[PDB]
Design a binder for this molecule. Sequence first.
Ligand SMILES: CO[C@@H](C)[C@@H](NC(=O)[C@H](CS)NC(=O)CCC[C@H](N)C(=O)O)C(=O)O
Ligand SMILES: [Fe+3]
Length: 329
Amino acid sequence: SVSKANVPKIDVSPLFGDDQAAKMRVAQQIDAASRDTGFFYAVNHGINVQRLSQKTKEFHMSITPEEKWDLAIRAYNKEHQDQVRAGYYLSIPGKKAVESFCYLNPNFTPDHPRIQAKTPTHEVNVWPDETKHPGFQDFAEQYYWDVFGLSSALLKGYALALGKEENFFARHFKPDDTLASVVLIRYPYLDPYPEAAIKTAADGTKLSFEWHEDVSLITVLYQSNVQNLQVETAAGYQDIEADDTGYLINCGSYMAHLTNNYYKAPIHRVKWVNAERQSLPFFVNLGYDSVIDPFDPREPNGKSDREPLSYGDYLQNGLVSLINKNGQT
Ligand SMILES: CO[C@@H](C)[C@@H](NC(=O)[C@H](CS)NC(=O)CCC[C@H](N)C(=O)O)C(=O)O
Ligand SMILES: [Fe+3]
């Protein structure tokens, strides 16, 4: 009834090493995948995803309602005016099923110059009490760095794929200032599952989250082995198979901008599934003042009629618009 999307499995291990020819062969596969459905699985990525899953499960299943208010973002807790991005996003039983915890760069500390300046989109992370969640903060911060590593390698692949030197994106993706986020999303099993938490697409498909493009350079996603994603193709919406051993990778609308839509931000959506599962994105965001000059890999002189857009500008307005379009998560 719905056809399977072409989502290749790409061994990205050469992107960590020094074999330039092998790196170019990976880059070709990323180009291919980016020009086709816009999705691929990164395999041989080196990340312990089963441990991520386990640690995340321990957290979601032990956090209490009291803790969630204490950690809640501003949209749920008016007292937490600084928490626009980082913290807990509550469920609303009977209305909204999904809940999550988002955290930013661990280097956004109280002394960070961007935190001092109160620059939008920079926040100091909030964490649960260590005795209630032993090891969690340390685990999560280390995870950030492990997926940051993977991400840097991927960005070397995308840069090569676009005819650039391998540090073309990665030079703007830096430990000290990246706006990248981790979200630890819980999609619950509910019996009965409230109809109010289920959206219906124009084509009749039951959804948890409507069609959209990502607010990211690239999105680096772990999920449970429960099929849920669809991508819009010329042949209609197609199902993206689950693979809980790989990371699902796609471009966001910043990459679209930079490449003049050579690498499109694929339009996708999340089907409603009544299952207890995890969706753990890392949104690969650059620095607040990062600007890459837009170019066009299909044009002889490489020139584009797109204007430079700073990442911070892109991100703050992106995140607002996505809430407007698709609802407060
Ligand atoms: C596969 O979809 C994934 C990534 C997940 N969806 C999302 O995470 C959605 C749409 S990409 N993203 C968002 O809602 C943006 C969140 C940004 C975050 N609060 C930040 O401050 O950086 C899900 O709904 O399971
Ligand atoms: Fe998305």
